[model samples]
Target chain A: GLFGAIAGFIEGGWPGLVAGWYGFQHSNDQGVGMAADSDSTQKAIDKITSKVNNIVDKMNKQYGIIDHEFSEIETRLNMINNKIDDQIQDIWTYNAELLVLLENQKTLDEHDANVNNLYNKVKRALGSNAMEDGKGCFELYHKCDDQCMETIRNGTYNRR
Target chain B: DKICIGYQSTNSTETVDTLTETNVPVTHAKELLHTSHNGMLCATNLGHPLILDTCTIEGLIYGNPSCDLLLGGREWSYIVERPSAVNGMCYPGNVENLEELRSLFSSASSYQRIQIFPDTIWNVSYSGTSSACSDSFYRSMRWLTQKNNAYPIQDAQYTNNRGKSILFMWGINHPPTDTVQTNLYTRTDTTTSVTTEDINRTFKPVIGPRPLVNGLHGRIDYYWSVLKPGQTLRVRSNGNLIAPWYGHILSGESHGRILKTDLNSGNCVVQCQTERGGLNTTLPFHNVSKYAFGNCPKYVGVKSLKLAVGLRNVPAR
Candidate 1:
């Protein structure tokens, strides 16, 4: 009886293929009968496919929400970083201006020293011999001589 | 209308009783006459004096007199009860000022109180000796100065037939300050002894780095007697005796090294001595008595012992 049944099953075409595929796929059923012979197996596969589609839909919705939140965070961080970079640039510009002001102050001090030295040299060239009178072009000579004499007495004037 | 009563007791549960027409309230005649009893009687709250004539009154009176009276009064009685110790006898009026009372009790000559009631009398006795009482009265006389802080000189008393006396002196190992060095010596002789095998018998030599003030040197000496039979006296420096025989010589013009050997019978003179420089440096001395001598007598009488001698230099601030 088993051999006759096997011969009948082998002779079947599409029905035999489906039956063979079912048997091979469900071989581990052991003594338990296969849950879905052919029609029921098709129905189960359709149900699982529908469930996986629903899961994918839910994951896509969640991913959209997470991506929007991450974009908002990135925008805020970029804005903060830009503000910090601008502030650092402003500090560097202010330091450069301070260095220029300090150099200008040194130049002004040197100019004042040069003007004082020229006035003292001019007074020394017209000596005390021209300054016997109190009032004249000679008086200018005497005034310059007095300033040079005072500087010498105070030990502050250079020979040049 | 029926009235409700509330009563509390330590031995039993509290109770609330209601009197109705079915249970005619009984009351006591004595409760009607007295105000305090009226309060106690009314605690059950059956109709006032009218319940006294009820049959329940007659029945309850036979079994419980207090319950019968309580039905006559419409109001309940309240009692402020406390334990015996906390019954306001020891501490009256809420004990708001316990410290003040403690002070008064400390100084008060005597404390007594009497209470007389119409039928009873009570007496309170609160007179006794206490440190609080003595402290309160003689607080001014209590010595405020710490004895340990001040250097106390040892006093000598004649013990044996010999005229030798012993003094145990104690002072700070450091030099005394100006105010303290003047009142430096206050001596008291009190002998104490202890026998133990693990006693630290080693005499640590007076190590220096002795303190100097304004070019003046400070020195301290300790004098005491030990009974030893032909015990060798040695001064050890760095664990080596500089001169062993130099310690045994008693008679000499030596101001600091003098020791009297024949002062008493069965008593050998022993002095642990040290000296320091005037103001600049310290004179080095050897450490002695690190080990016990087995040949010496078991019980040695130590007497006329001076523990500390303070050194002071003057005219330096």
Candidate 2:
């Protein structure tokens, strides 16, 4: 549910809003059965996963040449499967900021920067936005769910 | 009672504690404690023997009073515990004539009297004119000079300003003063024309000696008697505390007594000739390894004794 919100928010702010309105309308049209909306949720999950994979693909090909640091680049490549890669999954659960983080981590890996330097770089770049209370995006997603659930409880599901 | 030894850098805990104990001005500690080397500082108490007290040839020729020259008595046991390395002030120094000097020497607290002249055997005649005394004095002074030079005070950051004291921290960093050979009898450099005043600038005489007026000679004796050859005799030099030298008594000398010392090797030489009536008692067999100082007749002991020896390399007035 959190992933769906992040993906939708990232795609097109207004377009995602319009899609949400349409989903609400269609759910009313189908009556109060929970089975109908499950299909749309599954479709959104798949879309978000495909979006993440595309970002990864773009990141993998984006390496630029800097002549002096070839040895550094070689070293980073050696650590591709290290903690920097491992931490990407941990940071993902926070927000849609994963795209920026993953891209930065990938760029740092290409440059052969160590974890300590990478953290300093990330901290310098992100400043206050680097960390979250971790509940903002989750709450946003649940708020929408709460509204939808309220409509169902009122027997107004598919009533539009 | 314990001295801080081994390598102590400016930032080491021991170094910091030394600075604190000596009450070195906080600002100056930062400025002075900075050093390129590791063994820059040593912590010693207020009672530690000043390097001048070593009674070397330079000390004798320069008229610097020493433990060996001032307090050691014949056929007896004593130790000169310098009261405080620095105290009092005098532009024209203490006691007028030789009688006044003797009176002053006798009136000095008994605790400050050092009877243990490890290199100087008991019963030796103490006279400035006697060949035996001069020879004995030279040997004691040489041994002392060598031992004193081995432990450099690093710098003159620590000083005392109390009592009638003549002690000076003759830093090894100072040229020519590094060895007794150069500073022993003359301050004038023949080639460069370096004078005593210039040497005085390099040799910072920052401390004075506290009189042992209220001191406990009995307590020091007890401590000295309890001290075995291997044990340490911690003393305050200037304001720093250190036990870099080890004490070694001659064989047949009293046990559990503070004796002769080596250069902090931790191995004390005992059962050798330092004992009473031992080979050290004879003139020819007197040379002992690692031990320094010789006994003087009471008169000779106080000959070089002064309230304060002027700036190092400058003869005491």
Candidate 3:
């Protein structure tokens, strides 16, 4: 092991350029701890402190540039999310859907009783249709008993 | 001398001719003018149709005047005789700051200006006039005219700042006409005569009383001022000493089925049966700018002159 540690430091023809990158962890990391009383060893290690601090400062600057790049991507992705969400939501016509499930569809009843409770399962999973807003149609709804009903009129509305 | 005139119904709203048409009885349009005579406030420009027209708080004068201010003409309706220089008398930094400023603001305390603004436009005391308002209607008009002092006001974009917004203290000088002087009343007051005899008066111009518009109770402006949703509203009225005008909660965009009408001593509430905007405007509430440019009565300004016809101190009968 001593031969192994010394071989990595044998190159570069320099005094302190001994250990390889990962090799320093196993070798000289403890080298200073054991030879703390040596004047030359202590002075040389203190001199290297300034260069180590300089390396950390450049890391901070590099991370800031990456964060700014991330912001542009976020802006683009969020814009797509808004428009795409609006498009996907166009399918659930609350009034129209409720009409198909319950043919006695003149208006919303307290419960989806006419269907034996088939649509109630889907209604629970999808949450409420009380706030369905498409591009130009304002949709309003109310919840009564254990059922939901909505009214859609022509106008601008943006809801989920 | 008392004079009266009427243009053939509809179209050609204005024409600056001498009052020689014996066919109709008309007043010397000079004594009273619609809009107001502030500065170059009457010249129409850009997408504009007239050489001289004004935009006061209400739409264009001459086209459809308050019927009270006779000055509403094609251009210089009342100015039969142009005064000497002073850049053709284009003074007055703001319509409220004109030489007539004294009159427009004259004893406005006597006539209370309607200052109910749920929107906070009139929530604060105005700098110039104590009782004046700052609604969106003429809020921009005042902002435009009061810019650079000196002769530079002419270069601004506001309708030449002469037309004193009646909303600003109801800018009337002289006093309410002796023939028709009535104390102004708010919508809160209940006057039976106004709802009765007053409605049947001769000058019953289609658009209710000019003094009280944009209030509540199914009026044109009531529906136009809807900025949000919650409920809709309506405006209507007049009573006397001053006619009592009334309105309610919200202003909407479109007309709807009159759902409910709760008319009490003071609190009036009118809501639309449906919760949508009105698709069209009916009589007395059509688009003013459209109708102003369309058909209206024609008129000419009569020169200023004094006429005295007395019957010997009421003939001691």
lDDT of each: 0.21, 0.22, 0.19
lDDT of 2 by residue, A1-160 (tens): 1222211222211112221111221123234222112333345336444544554343322111111112333576546544553354334322223333343333222212221222233234333332422321111112224455444323342323
**TM-scores of the candidates in the order shown:** 0.14, 0.15, 0.13
Sort all candidates by lDDT, best to worst. 2, 1, 3
In the range B1-317, model 3's lDDT, one tens digit per residue, is 00000011111122222222211111111111122111221211111111111223122211112222323222211111112111211111122223233222221222212222222222111222111222222211111111122111011001112222222111111112322222222222222211111122111112232342233211111101111222222112222211111111211111111111111111211110111111111111111111121111111122211111100011111
Tell me the spans in candidate 2 whose CA falls farther than 4 Å from its real position: A1-136, A144-160, B1-317
Highest TM-score, which number?
A: 2
Q: What is the DockQ of each candidate?
A: 0.00, 0.01, 0.00
Candidate 1 off by > 4 Å: A1-71, A125-127, A130-160, B1-317
> For all candidates listed, what's the TM-score of chain B alone?
0.13, 0.17, 0.14
Q: Which of 2 and 3 is the better model by TM-score?
A: 2
Name the weakest run of 10 consecutive residues (lDDT summed) in model 1 chain B: B28-37
Interface quality of candidate 2 as DockQ: 0.01
Identify the CAPRI category of the predicted complex in candidate 3.
Answer: incorrect
Number of clashing residue pairs, candidate 2: 41
